[PDB]
Ligand binder design. Structure first.
Ligand SMILES: Cc1cc2nc3c(=O)[nH]c(=O)nc-3n(C[C@H](O)[C@H](O)[C@H](O)CO)c2cc1C
Ligand SMILES: COC1=C(OC)C(=O)C(CC=C(C)C)=C(C)C1=O
Ligand code: FES
Lengths: 446, 412, 32, 202, 198, 250
């Protein structure tokens, strides 16, 4: 067991009820083009074309051979593009049940499958995009291998769904997916979980490691730092538990499995709960009739690291397993910065809120201040559990010094790994965007 | 108020007739009301703490020291005046100095039986003009630099101005105070880009300017008690002359006990005398997590070790060798610098290991300058400025060790 | 004028010794 | 003519080339030492460039530095002997920095970069020009340091000191080294404000 | 050992060559961009200064000082040419030695030797040694201590300038101008030792 | 190559050496007189003699001032080349100086030359004043002064600090003419012939034979001045010499 001490669990009101229920009927889904790092799409579809389930929609120029396939069967209704014609989303209206089928095997022979056969089926089905590399959080090249595949069987994000409930419903698919991963990896498979019991694979190279503590104990970046440190020459892959279930269903039934269980939660959700949905489901339709009145922000993913689901981005992300809804915090308070703050949450002890340990907060999207320079009062060290110097690493990101950031461990990090640093920053810096710019510069010169 | 700020907002936005004053407008509008801004990217929620509250807590943490300092400055001045003059001679002195007859005009008294109200009022007449001059002159430089570079005025000047005003003699001329704050704000802070981008403590850099440019008004036996014609040494100077037995308050004829120095019944800088008042203020900001207890712990470790070493070595000529650690704590500006000036996060080290070394260096340097430097009775300002130069070096040592661990895959 | 003659000789000899040392060092160290 | 005035502002040795800094900090406490040091550097630099260019076609490359420093040191020795004989008071104030003219980066910088590849007469002009730019900084820094630190210019009282029944309190820091760093830095800020082409890129 | 230890501490902090005598500022301000580059240059200054000062002390006492060779003959006017000549020779010899037998040392120290061949810090230290009339043992301690103090100052400046990657210096002061101000603020801190009669 | 290299080096060295040697030897005599005239001008100033031109300084110094060697231990004159004696250099040599103990070293000089040099200011053929060079450690550096004493051996005729490194506003006031004027008329010794000159902190009484006002805000430098006169008027300094002077010497 690995115990995490440094970190922060946000006590935001509206925690989901850990019971799975049927969601709203979803009439259209989409694939977000901006959520894939370094993806340059070559469109294989046009508006009005009818696509089958698991049919390729667009291909990646910078990552040859990777296919992004439709999650449902229907008709392409719109191809949203933004500044510089960047692919925002490809929206498909659900109509029909046509699909593309693949080879199916038995649970006994899954661990003995050839690696090239496994890669071929994953790439063709479009499920290869579930893997993300570390560093750079990109979809792995189809001809590359990894000695470490990390399964995120836990989630410490605020308002996150409990993985135990979902995995117990799909125990056979979860174990089958682990066997496929065991044959796929050249090294080991790290199933990172909490102390709760989970279905176990019988393969000797699949190892369960227990992580305890607050956020970010559940992030794949934390798990890699403590089990398989990553660098330029040591690349690891990560995949979440629900995608592992999809891998098991793919090799057991020969059909792409696009069902998802997402937690719908937040202060303005009337009944926070787990709802069954589909990949890329429209968040406008999913959240319909679920929210209290007023101006609210719908977030694909967690409040700490998620996409503002508005307009062409109002669809469930590829790697997101929750939907968060918050009020927009536009209120101006007279001397609000000088108030005692009985209902204000902070990592510091400058407010009366910390004196009430059992308090939950109706957090809004307010910034709680203006943008300023960094003044290191030591907040970053209280939420960073990795063996890094957070303050000096963050200054390098602000300064744009990519070479120094790499030496300080920027290659081991993702945007979500710096979400807590962004949260507790007195200067209101957004370190996720700064890190990605540094990572993009590193890849460009490599 | 809120409606007026919203209505005039368009005047200071680009294209308005008051665009060049946009920096001033945001400094005032955001002062009263929160900006009311929502997040734009990931981490859609934010911590409630911001720079304004951090700076205002430190600014409030020195209020107990400020109020006692005005009370102590008046008490020292009144006691010395009645020690020197009496009757008509005292009346002539009161009429000849505007500090004295302003106190008597506002209902106060300069007599030996003056209450705490008169003593604090007399101290106020010496401190408020200094604080007003420092605030106005320093604020002009802060606004001018922000207007030229087209940036919003970052917080932190309220802390700098009040700390600078509390570390100067009560008799400091106003024009020197204007020059001192100008050097600290412009040369030490603004040419580097403002708050969070400098390496040297701005308030102590301004005090170092006055220390070396005009040493006659910031040292000696004529500047620490605000009584005209009164010459009196302080505890650090007296101990350097004759040790513990020389601690005698000539204004009253009583020996300076340890409790007198701890409470703050001694002459010196305005806001440094009361160690108890500084402890109360420091406890609040240390508990809030604003001030670093690692730096404070390091300063105490450095002071205790080196002072004990001097006591063990001993000296038959230098009386400063036999001063214990607890006398070092309650004398001079050691407590003020340790609690509110060594803890400046921008000037200090950025690593926890570096903070311990940063604090130890300050504590060692302060005792060293007190003992083995005969020119200066105190060295807290010099110790902190010296340690600001090596604060980045401590961080470099720490990170290089961290990089070596990373290159070994943390032991794989 | 003994001081002048001594100054002229020592000035030349000091420089000559330095030049010869550098030339000898360069010939015995720098590869060719 | 332009070669004479070019190293004054466009190509200043101290403000741009970062040469000759050591003497600029030390000797600028007074105008008399700053003026004498200006003439000495200008005298040595011009003659060293002139003599080096004369023998530039015969200097062995193995001992090139030794040959150059033999000329530079010899000129400085003569300057030192003359200063002791006719300006003994100023020479005593200059202390070791009279000898440090040999190691002044301006003297060797121009001898190697220019005198080795130029005719003697242009080399003499180049040495005079760089001395003027070096002296321009020294006199400008020396003016403020002496006026604000003593109220005097060349020893002549301009601001009556309070100690002598006047009204001006001299600034002690102007007589201390840190003021020389500040004045030069702000002087560079002024030069590059009117000469934006000299601004270093970020 | 107290006399030598006192001299060593005096040459490092009390009389730091860079921030109390301000010699070698040209390389001090220029090469201080990076800590590792400054650290390499500082070691090279230590080695040259630790060798040059004792050698010039032997030359001055045996040859150049009055009544050294012939009574009544004073050759002290040859001090300037002799001191720089020795320094210029030893620095070049070290380049020929390090580049030949110790390629790792040539990368670590040899690449910085041409910069400090005629640097003011070496010549100033020799001149101060002659003025103070040190012995041979004191020359070794003074030479080593002066280099360590010089190395300490430039490395400290290098760490400050690396920290200043986050600064927002105005364009007019960017580069050389802000470096002068930085070194001036460092001089203030080192004045803490002024007045210590060690 | 080698022949050309050596020929150029030798020819260059010879030309440079001849110019350097000629300049050093030709100017040497003028160099040493400049050092002398600098100190001679200072001694004339403290003695109260007006001299402006360099020639005027030389003629007045030869006419009015006669340097003489004095042995500190015995107080008697010693025959020697007084005009060329270097007391500072003799103080640093073990064979011509004594190391002082902690009790004796009041002025913190750590050494004292065996024989010093005094300057007898003579008006014609009769000595009128004696110039005593004294030095003592200040706050920042050693401070060197000339004190002019009347033929009675007790009355100070003038004081002049000619080499000090104290702070100009605090400690550098030893060169202030107003402060120097206070020393005129003061008595060095009491009726018991003990050293009795006192630097009074906070200002000496206006009517005082031994009190001199201390430097304002410069107690440490004032202590250095007080220690300087305590040592040099004691038995280790000009004590025995001034005892013989007041008995009817000179
Ligand atoms: C705990 C704390 C201590 C501070 N101490 C000082 C100080 O001693 N002097 C000062 O000028 N500013 C001080 N500041 C304000 C500010 O952080 C400082 O001026 C930075 O150097 C601005 O870049 C302090 C701020 C905090 C939060
Ligand atoms: C305490 O925090 C602070 C402010 O508001 C709370 C300020 O307005 C300002 C701005 C002040 C002026 C004079 C523009 C500063 C500097 C500050 O530190
Ligand atoms: S002038 Fe001294 S190192 Fe260049």
């Amino acid at each position: 067991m690995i115990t995490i001490k440094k970190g922060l669990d946000l006590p935001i009101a509206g925690t989901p009820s850990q019971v799975i229920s049927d969601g709203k009927a979803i009439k259209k889904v989409a694939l977000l083009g901006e959520e894939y790092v370094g993806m340059r799409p070559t469109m294989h579809v046009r508006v009005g074309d009818e696509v089958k389930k698991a049919q390729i929609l667009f291909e990646d120029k910078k990552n040859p051979g990777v296919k992004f396939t439709s999650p449902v069967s229907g008709k392409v209704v719109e191809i949203n593009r933004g500044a510089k014609r960047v692919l925002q989303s490809v929206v498909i209206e659900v109509a029909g049940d046509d699909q593309v089928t693949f080879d199916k095997f038995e649970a006994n022979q899954l661990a003995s499958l050839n690696r090239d056969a496994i890669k071929t089926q994953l790439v063709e089905s479009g499920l290869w995009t579930a893997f993300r590399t570390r560093p750079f959080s990109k979809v792995p090249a189809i001809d590359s291998t990894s000695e470490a595949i990390f399964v995120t069987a836990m989630d410490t994000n605020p308002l996150a769904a409990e993985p135990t409930v979902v995995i117990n419903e799909q125990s056979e698919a979860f174990v089958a997916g682990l066997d496929v991963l065991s044959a796929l990896t050249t090294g080991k498979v790290y199933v990172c979980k909490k102390g709760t019991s989970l279905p176990r694979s019988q393969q000797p190279n699949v190892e369960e490691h227990v992580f305890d503590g607050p956020h970010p104990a559940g992030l794949a970046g934390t798990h890699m730092h403590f089990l398989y440190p990553v660098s330029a020459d040591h690349v690891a892959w990560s995949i979440n538990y629900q995608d592992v279930i999809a891998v098991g269903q793919l090799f057991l039934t020969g059909e792409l499995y696009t069902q998802r269980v997402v937690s719908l939660a937040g202060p303005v959700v009337n009944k926070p709960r787990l709802v069954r949905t589909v990949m890329g489901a429209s968040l406008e339709q999913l959240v319909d009739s679920e929210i209290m009145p007023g101006e609210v922000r719908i977030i694909s993913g967690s409040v700490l690291s998620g996409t503002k689901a508005t307009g062409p981005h109002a669809y469930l992300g590829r790697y997101h397993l929750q939907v968060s809804v918050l009020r927009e915090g536009r209120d101006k308070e007279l001397f609000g910065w000088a108030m005692p703050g009985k209902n204000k949450f902070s990592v510091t002890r400058s407010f009366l809120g910390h004196l009430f340990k059992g308090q939950v907060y109706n957090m809004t999207t307010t910034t709680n201040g203006s943008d300023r320079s960094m003044v290191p009062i030591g907040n970053y060290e209280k939420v960073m559990p990795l063996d890094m110097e957070p303050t000096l690493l963050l200054r390098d990101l602000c300064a744009g010094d990519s070479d120094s950031a790499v030496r300080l461990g920027a290659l081991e990090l993702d945007e979500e790994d710096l979400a807590l640093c962004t949260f507790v920053c007195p200067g209101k810096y957004e370190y996720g965007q700064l890190l990605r710019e540094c990572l993009d510069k590193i890849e460009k010169e490599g | 108020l809120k409606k007026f700020l919203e209505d005039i907002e368009h005047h200071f936005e680009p294209g308005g007739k008051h665009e060049k004053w946009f920096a001033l407008y945001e400094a005032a509008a955001t002062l009263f009301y929160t900006p009311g801004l929502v997040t734009k990217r990931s981490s859609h929620v934010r911590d409630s703490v911001d720079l304004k509250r951090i700076m205002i807590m430190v600014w409030l943490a020195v209020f107990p020291a400020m109020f006692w300092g005005m009370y102590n400055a008046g008490g020292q001045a009144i006691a010395a005046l009645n020690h020197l003059y009496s009757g008509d001679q005292l009346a002539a002195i009161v009429a000849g100095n505007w500090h004295y007859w302003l106190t008597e005009m506002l209902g106060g008294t300069m007599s030996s039986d003056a209450g705490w109200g008169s003593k604090m009022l007399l101290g106020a007449t010496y401190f408020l003009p200094i604080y007003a001059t420092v605030f106005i002159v320093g604020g002009f430089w802060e606004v001018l630099f922000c207007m030229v570079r087209k940036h919003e005025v970052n917080e932190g000047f309220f802390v700098t101005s009040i700390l600078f005003a509390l570390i100067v003699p009560p008799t400091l001329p106003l024009w020197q105070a204007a020059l001192g704050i100008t050097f600290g704000v412009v040369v030490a802070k603004e040419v580097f880009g403002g708050t969070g981008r400098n390496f040297l403590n701005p308030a102590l850099a301004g005090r170092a300017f006055l220390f070396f440019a005009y040493p006659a008004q910031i040292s000696g036996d004529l500047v620490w008690t605000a009584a005209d014609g009164y010459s009196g040494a302080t505890a650090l100077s007296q101990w350097a002359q004759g040790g513990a037995g020389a601690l005698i308050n000539n204004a009253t004829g009583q020996t300076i006990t340890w409790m007198d120095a701890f409470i703050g019944n001694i002459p010196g800088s305005i806001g440094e005398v009361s160690t108890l008042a500084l402890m109360i203020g420091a406890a609040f900001i240390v508990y809030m997590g604003i001030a670093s207890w690692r730096i404070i712990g390091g300063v105490m470790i450095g002071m205790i070790l080196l002072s004990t070493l001097f006591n063990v070595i001993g000296s038959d000529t230098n009386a400063m060798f036999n001063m214990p650690w607890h006398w070092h704590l309650v004398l001079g500006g050691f407590a003020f610098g340790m609690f509110f000036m060594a803890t400046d996060p921008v000037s200090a080290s950025f690593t926890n290991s570096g903070k311990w070394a940063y604090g130890i260096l300050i504590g060692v340097m302060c005792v060293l300058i007190r003992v083995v430097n005969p020119a200066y009775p105190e060295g807290m300002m010099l110790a902190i400025l010296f340690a600001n130069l090596f604060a980045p070096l401590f961080d470099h040592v720490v990170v290089e060790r961290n990089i070596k661990r990373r290159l070994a895959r943390y032991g794989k | 004028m003994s001081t002048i003659i001594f100054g002229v000789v020592m000035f030349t000899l000091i420089i000559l010794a330095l030049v010869l040392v550098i030339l000898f060092a360069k010939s015995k160290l720098v590869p060719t | 003519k332009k070669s004479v005035l070019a190293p004054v502002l466009d190509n200043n040795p101290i403000a741009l080339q970062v040469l000759g800094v050591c003497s600029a900090l030390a000797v600028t406490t007074k105008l008399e030492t700053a003026f004498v040091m200006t003439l000495a550097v200008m005298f040595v630099t011009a003659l060293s460039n002139f003599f080096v260019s004369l023998i530039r076609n015969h200097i062995p490359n193995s001992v090139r530095i030794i040959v150059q420093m033999a000329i530079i040191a010899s000129l400085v020795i003569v300057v030192d002997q003359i200063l002791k004989a006719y300006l003994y008071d100023i020479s005593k104030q200059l202390s070791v920095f009279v000898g440090l003219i040999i190691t002044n980066c301006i003297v060797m910088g121009r001898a190697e970069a220019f005198a080795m590849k130029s005719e003697p007469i242009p080399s003499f002009i180049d040495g005079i020009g760089n001395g003027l730019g070096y002296g321009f900084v020294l006199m400008t820094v020396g003016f403020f340091r002496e006026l604000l630190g003593s109220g005097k210019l060349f020893g002549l009282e301009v601001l009556p000191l309070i100690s002598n029944g006047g009204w001006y309190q001299p600034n002690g820091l102007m007589l201390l080294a840190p003021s020389a760093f500040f004045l030069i830095g702000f002087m560079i800020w002024a030069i590059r404000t009117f000469k934006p082409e000299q601004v270093e890129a970020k | 050992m107290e006399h030598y230890i006192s001299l060593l501490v005096k040459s490092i902090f009390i009389e730091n060559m860079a921030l109390s005598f301000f010699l070698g500022m040209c390389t001090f301000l220029a090469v201080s961009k990076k800590v590792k580059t400054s650290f390499g240059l500082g070691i090279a200054v230590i080695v040259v200064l630790t060798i040059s000062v004792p050698v010039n002390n032997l030359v001055y006492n045996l040859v150049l000082k009055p009544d050294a060779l012939v009574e009544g003959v004073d050759l002290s006017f040859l001090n300037f040419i002799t001191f720089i000549g020795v320094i210029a020779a030893l620095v070049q010899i070290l380049e020929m030695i390090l580049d030949r037998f110790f390629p790792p040392l040539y990368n670590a120290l040899g690449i910085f030797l041409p910069l400090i061949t005629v640097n003011c810090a070496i010549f100033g230290g020799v001149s101060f040694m002659v003025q103070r009339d040190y012995s041979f043992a004191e020359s070794v301690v003074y030479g080593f201590g002066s280099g360590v103090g010089w190395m300490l100052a430039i490395v400290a400046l290098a760490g400050i300038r690396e920290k200043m990657k986050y600064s927002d210096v105005p364009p007019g002061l960017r580069g050389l101008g802000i470096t002068f101000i930085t070194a001036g603020l460092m001089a203030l801190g080192f004045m803490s030792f002024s007045g210590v009669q060690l | 190559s080698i022949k050309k290299t050596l020929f150029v080096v030798i020819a260059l060295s010879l030309v440079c050496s001849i110019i350097v040697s000629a300049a050093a030897v030709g100017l040497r005599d003028k160099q040493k007189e400049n050092a002398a005239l600098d100190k001679q001008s200072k001694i004339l100033q403290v003695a109260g003699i007006e001299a402006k031109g360099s020639k005027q300084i030389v003629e007045l110094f030869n006419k009015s001032i006669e340097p003489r060697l004095v042995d500190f231990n015995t107080g008697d004159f010693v025959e020697g080349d007084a005009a060329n004696y270097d007391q500072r250099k003799a103080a640093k040599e073990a064979s011509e100086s004594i190391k002082l103990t902690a009790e004796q070293d009041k002025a913190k000089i750590q050494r004292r030359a065996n024989v010093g040099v005094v300057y007898l200011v003579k008006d014609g053929d009769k000595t009128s004043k004696v110039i005593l060079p004294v030095h003592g450690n200040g706050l920042w550096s050693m401070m060197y002064a000339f004190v002019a004493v009347e033929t009675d051996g007790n009355t100070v005729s003038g004081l002049t600090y000619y080499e000090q490194g104290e702070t100009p506003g605090l400690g550098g006031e030893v060169e202030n003419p107003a402060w120097r004027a206070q020393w005129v008329g003061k008595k060095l010794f009491d009726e018991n012939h003990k050293p009795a000159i006192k630097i009074v902190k906070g200002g000496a009484p206006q009517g005082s034979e031994h009190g001199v006002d201390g430097l304002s805000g410069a107690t440490l430098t004032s202590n250095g001045v007080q220690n300087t006169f305590d040592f040099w008027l004691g038995d280790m300094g000009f004590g025995p010499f001034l005892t013989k002077v007041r008995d009817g010497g000179l």
